[PDB]
Ligand SMILES: Cc1nn(-c2nc3ccccc3[nH]2)c(O)c1C(c1ccccn1)c1c(C)nn(-c2nc3ccccc3[nH]2)c1O
Ligand SMILES: Cc1nn(-c2nc3ccccc3[nH]2)c(O)c1C(c1ccccn1)c1c(C)nn(-c2nc3ccccc3[nH]2)c1O
């Protein structure tokens with residue numbers, strides 16, 4: 001039954017660098033204007049399409065390095081932090097000793113169109129969501145110590161090299177002045193360098209279906225969210241849950257031969273299965289922050305997960321009619 | 325006879341505390357050099373110390389790097405490896421016309437180091453300075469760092485695509501390259517250096533990313549390289565009172581080994597069980613390079629390390645005879 005999945009992927013691919021050229025013009029302009037300011041002088045780039053079905057909705061991130069940062073964990077949430085400082089161009093945005101996300105974002109929007117993580121620009125069909133992020137080159141927070149468990153797949157050496165890279169903090173409510181950990185750069189680097197073999201997907205002998213499986217999962221969730229957009233059951237699910245579950249599946253299946261392209265049908269099915277399991281048991285560990293449960297009852301209620309479970313099982317039993 | 329090979333490797337493994345002493349000197353030198361405007365951005369390539377000889381644990385090798393932004397290279401004759409350094413300036417005090425003088429820069433480098441050393445002893449281009457700590461030796465090399473694109477002479481080198489992948493080769497070529505002062509057969513030229521890339525490929529050396537991180541994936545690449553280098557070191561020692569082997573170096577061994585890695589890209593061609601054959605096939609390849617007088621620089625394909633203009637055929641024939649004898653008699657020089 002994988003032929004239908006292949007048809008779906010063909011249609012998704014036929015739907016580019018033009019629109020991105022327009023977006024690039026606008027983003028370079030905005031970054032120059034921001035760089036003229038004392039507080040955002042170090043602003044910089046770390047295009048991405050959050051929804052695979054929306055080729056004209058872009059997502060970019062403006063970073064800003066914060067040297068010698070001091071993090072205060074909010075409420076043992078493992079993912080949300082106050083940003084204190086350990087000579088400070090962000091002093092304009094302090095509320096006591098904490099960097100205020102409110103003031104910083106207010107000024108950021110000022111320099112920058114439409115309304116945490118911060119601005120939606122139009123450039124008649126193209127939309128661009130811009131998120132502000134602090135960059136830190138300090139070691140990763142202690143809540144990540146047991147995350148990114150790629151040692152049996154991409155290797156312990158790669159894990160060390162990745163953990164030597166910066167981490168990011170985006171403004172997000174937990175209490176209004178908290179910042180949330182972001183590792184989207186690591187997710188991207190893994191997705192584009194995803195095999196146990198370094199030449200994975202560089203030759204016919206070593207073609208795998210990891211990326212295709214992820215795209216099919218994201219498209220399944222997007223189609224289901226669209227179809228039931230009039231109900232509220234699926235409003236809290238996002239491609240972040242899909243990507244986290246996909247990375248967990250990659251950890252469970254670390255060999256390239258478990259992702260042979262010929263087995264797309266099974267591989268995708270496996271992905272679906274794991275996601276469904278996560279829904280039923282209400283457990284989806286953040287891939288980088290293992291004590292953060294994205295499927296906690298404090299975040300998504302039981303009924304929403306049961307509804308998504310039923311809809312997905314229906315789709316799989318009927319060869320995914322929502323793909324059409 | 326692979327058991328003897330593994331015995332040799334065991335003995336080579338069995339103090340490197342010594343580095344401590346090395347570090348103590350190195351840091352201090354770097355402190356002093358950083359007070360000068362010309363050497364303001366000096367640092368360690370980074371690992372403070374390396375060893376060019378597997379059998380000289382007290383003989384260390386250090387590279388001090390210094391970034392030259394907006395560098396302009398001009399290739400000497402068509403050497404493909406040697407260049408004059410010009411600029412597109414804290415180094416303007418060493419400028420002879422429009423070209424950076426290796427002689428003046430080196431003179432100042434060693435002057436500063438000598439004055440700092442006096443507060444260790446100094447021995448009199450590339451290993452700019454040799455310091456003897458206590459009774460421990462440290463060869464220090466000055467290198468310019470350029471973060472611009474690699475020179476055009478390297479465009480078809482580093483052919484690791486079928487071994488370490490094309491993505492890895494692109495990432496490696498995005499790293500800086502280095503220029504070490506070195507005279508050419510002309511005394512104000514600089515020679516390309518990629519020893520950082522060499523270290524990276526040796527310590528991340530398999531097609532599989534988990535090569536040598538578990539029992540199922542142990543390969544014998546590093547052991548074959550160690551055995552080749554020990555073979556050369558022992559042969560150069562045994563015949564050091566003749567000049568026949570003075571021009572051969574661990575660089576030749578390493579270059580030939582990397583070529584063999586390109587020829588045998590699969591981890592299953594380096595299974596630890598097959599150490600004996602793998603090493604043999606390394607020796608053979610090196611031998612081939614000696615007979616045909618051809619050993620392309622792994623990063624600069626048109627620079628022939630075994631050219632008749634660099635090493636004459638008498639030396640290559642002597643080394644071939646010695647190596648073939650050793651291989652036919654189960655390597656008694658290892659003892
Ligand atoms: C990925 C992502 N898909 N996505 C999405 N998928 C859709 C599918 C159909 C229709 C609409 C859709 N919208 C979305 O809205 C995000 C955002 C995001 C995208 C861009 C900018 C900001 N946010 C995000 C979220 C919802 N959660 N999240 C996150 N939760 C965390 C918890 C702990 C630690 C880190 C965390 N990161 C995150 O990054
Ligand atoms: C000679 C040498 N050419 N070379 C080189 N030639 C090039 C030609 C074109 C492009 C790049 C090139 N790089 C190089 O990088 C060295 C180094 C070295 C190191 C530090 C400073 C200067 N050169 C070295 C090594 C790698 N081994 N080695 C050595 N092996 C020994 C074994 C036994 C006994 C003594 C030994 N000495 C040694 O001298």
Ligand SMILES: [Zn+2]
Nearest residue numbers: 195200201208
């Ligand atoms: Zn692949």
Ligand SMILES: [Zn+2]
Nearest residue numbers: 530535536543
């Ligand atoms: Zn190995």
